[PDB]
Curated annotation (Swiss-Prot):
PROSITE patterns: ALPHA_CA_1, ALPHA_CA_2
Outcome recorded upon mutating V139H: Impaired activity
This protein's name: Carbonic anhydrase 2
Activity regulation (record text): Activated by X-ray, histamine, L-adrenaline, L- and D-phenylalanine, L- and D-histidine, L-His-OMe and beta-Ala-His (carnosine).
Consequence of changing T195 to D/E: Strongly reduced activity, but enhanced zinc affinity
Variation of activity with pH: Optimum pH is 6-8.
CC terms in the record's Gene Ontology section: apical part of cell; cytoplasm; cytosol; extracellular exosome; myelin sheath; plasma membrane
Limits of the Alpha-carbonic anhydrase domain: 1-256
Effect of K15E: In Jogjakarta
Length: 257
């Protein structure tokens, strides 16, 4: 099965998932000088006040904080989007070292980690239908740099000891994802894909310009997770990022000058 190792990592994915070499793959390098301001782009509308978190799961590739998406409780609208996109889960990608871990890069710069808040277009009725559509998902991506702690992240950090290995989950109610956002909602946007298999080309990417800062201790705790299941040989969950893919026939648009 696919993963992030030498023998099953991103260079191998195309054999099971030929769309890996497709026309709108993610992530990409964001060349800030070549991105163009699009004055028609609207401000993002992030409406997370009624978000209902449920559970946190180690799925063997990352950990997901899952939400109740059976009603419009936490939604993303505006920006490049037409319609309403419901928050289903968030997760991170991170490195073994503070100088790598993000999936997107900015002028070739890698951040220590990247947060993905995953939303699906409610006109398609369920997430499984949405991933089959070119405008099915909107993923809000937020860079993490190492510096001061992010207080809104600490509850996530605190529970990781309970989901160390693949397949473990824990209750994770009453978590407020607003505590993970930076001050500014300025963003870049482009059409892309899931960054893991099955690599479906269903995502409108919205990547925030402003990173959040997390502490060295917070990211160290991410790095104590395991890719393996309990009772299997220990493999630290680190470097679970796909590198930047060719931009091909795409333009990245900026919401800001
Ligand atoms: C077919 N089916 C599609 C649903 N997939 N589930 C999820 S949560 N996939 C998923 C993968 C990568 C991202 S990312 N890193 O692009 O945000 C976001 C979501 C399971 C398999
Ligand atoms: Zn992701």
């Amino acid at each position: 099965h696919w993963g992030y190792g030498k023998h099953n990592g991103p260079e191998h994915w195309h054999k099971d998932f030929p769309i890996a070499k497709g026309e709108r793959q993610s992530p990409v390098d964001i060349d800030t000088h070549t991105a163009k301001y699009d004055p028609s782009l609207k401000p993002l509308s992030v409406s997370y006040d009624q978000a209902t978190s449920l559970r946190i799961l180690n799925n063997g590739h990352a950990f997901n904080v899952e939400f109740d998406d059976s009603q419009d409780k936490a939604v993303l609208k505006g920006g490049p989007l037409d319609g309403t996109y419901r928050l289903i889960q968030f997760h991170f990608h991170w490195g073994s070292l503070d100088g790598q871990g993000s999936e997107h890069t900015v002028d070739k710069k890698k951040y220590a980690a990247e947060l993905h808040l995953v939303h699906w277009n409610t006109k398609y009725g369920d997430f499984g239908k949405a991933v089959q559509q070119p405008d099915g998902l909107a993923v809000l991506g937020i860079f993490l740099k190492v510096g001061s702690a992010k207080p809104g992240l600490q509850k996530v950090v605190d529970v990781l000891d309970s989901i160390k290995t693949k397949g473990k989950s824990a209750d994770f109610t009453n978590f407020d994802p607003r505590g993970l956002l930076p001050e500014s909602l300025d963003y870049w946007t482009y059409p892309g894909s899931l960054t893991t298999p099955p690599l479906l080309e269903c995502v409108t990417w919205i990547v925030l310009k402003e990173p959040i800062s997390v502490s060295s201790e917070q990211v160290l705790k991410f790095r104590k997770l395991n890719f393996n299941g309990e009772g299997e040989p220990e493999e630290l969950m680190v470097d679970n990022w796909r590198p930047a893919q060719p931009l091909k026939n795409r333009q990245i648009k900026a919401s800001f000058k």
